[PDB]
Amino acid sequence: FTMDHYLDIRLRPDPEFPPAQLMSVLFGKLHQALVAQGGDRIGVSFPDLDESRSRLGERLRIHASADDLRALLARPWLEGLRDHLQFGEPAVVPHPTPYRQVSRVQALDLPFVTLRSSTGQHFRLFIRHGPLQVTAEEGGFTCYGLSKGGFVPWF
Template identity: 30%
Template sequence: MKYYLDITLLPDAEANLGFLWQKVFQQVHIALVDNKVGDNESAVALSVVGYGDKAFPLGNKLRLLAASEDILQKLDMQRWLNRLSDYCHLSSIKPVPAEVKQYARFNRKNVKSIEKKAQRRAVHLAKSYNEVLAYLIEEGKSKECKLPFINVESQESKKQSGQGVSCQFLLFIEKTLFDEAVNGKFDCYGLSKTATVPWF
């Protein structure tokens, strides 16, 4: 990843950071799908610059990175974020600094809902769903996922329903730091199970 552009979120009284992350990330995802290079594969990666921020766990900036300037120009994020222009600022495309010392992997962490877990265990243990659910709620209080997340609207379920009805889900994002770059593929959320992005 040699080039990047930053998208800074600009919250106000009407639109908080959580709302803006949802709307901006949705548009980024649609842009990545529209420009995919393979089945659910993107040439553009995502970096959550303010990950772990005390005020808001995802911070107020996301960074898109690519191997070439042309890839980011072709993505044309200005067009995708046009209706949100009052709430976000796009930087110009810049080269990644040469002195990067760390790399970060941002991957999607699948967190199963407690209800689905209770259904499976109830069948497996031949116990009532409510009994298993109550146990899991009590047991899980200390095990709740603490990772930052984005509320995402599934475009696939909207398409499959044929009626424009969408399904919302929480996309949990995990960050891991590395001393060296790791190559790999990025999905259409800009996330990867293996690949890293420059962390600066």
Template identity: 30%
Template structure:
């Protein structure tokens, strides 16, 4: 699928709805629109995101949700009722062509099954380990993945309760890789084991 165009969606902050919560609501609307339409040529990126570190463990989604796709696919998506209801809460710029000079980025879901502390507690209880033994089995490095930004979402296909959708942004060398995208706007691995790239700028 050609990601020739993009549009930036930016939530308008409200007194009772801060940017992180507004970004979550926006992403939920996007998920509904993509799930119900069956569109698989729309990708997302978070151009203003930040990842946490051990010293500063707080990650951020940023304040912009960027949609990538063919111009017609983006136009059709934004005409859906899910997006019309957001007119007063989200700033939409115009659909624009992607700049000539871009990098290639793979944005994908990273599954974090459990926090380190929870794993340690379980090991102590089930396997009768000491606290030191549990720390040895589950060192602090296991927690690194949770430093990624995430959306709290509910799956429409599985009716799963709210879960954290952690997102990894990784720059890659070489030619862009085309492909299809899920109802979350994330690339699906192809037969060669590659994830599609999105233009990063």
């Protein structure tokens, strides 16, 4: 379990943008930072997830090794959003915790973020937090920080 570090990024409430819109922007920006860092050892989870309202919640948690996390934060990927966010301190995770897969699931009672890309076009990216396991099977993460096998601590 070499991914024992995390950081919480919290959305500040905003009069003109609902949470879901900011989160999508946060999440698109992280996507860009992941595509640049390279690798597959950075995951995310949405700790305030609400199953019932199908809402991702107001927090984005980023999971990484102590130094994967540092390389990531020393990038200017949050340039332009920071005013809309509050950040926790990079910390060691609590233990013990369950682990789960947070994956892209391509009627969907699922939360989603809206992104763009070469077309101008908007698309929804659907996200599912998986069943709690006692331990973590090995595996990596996509360029969205979503599971391609890997698991993240849930707390």
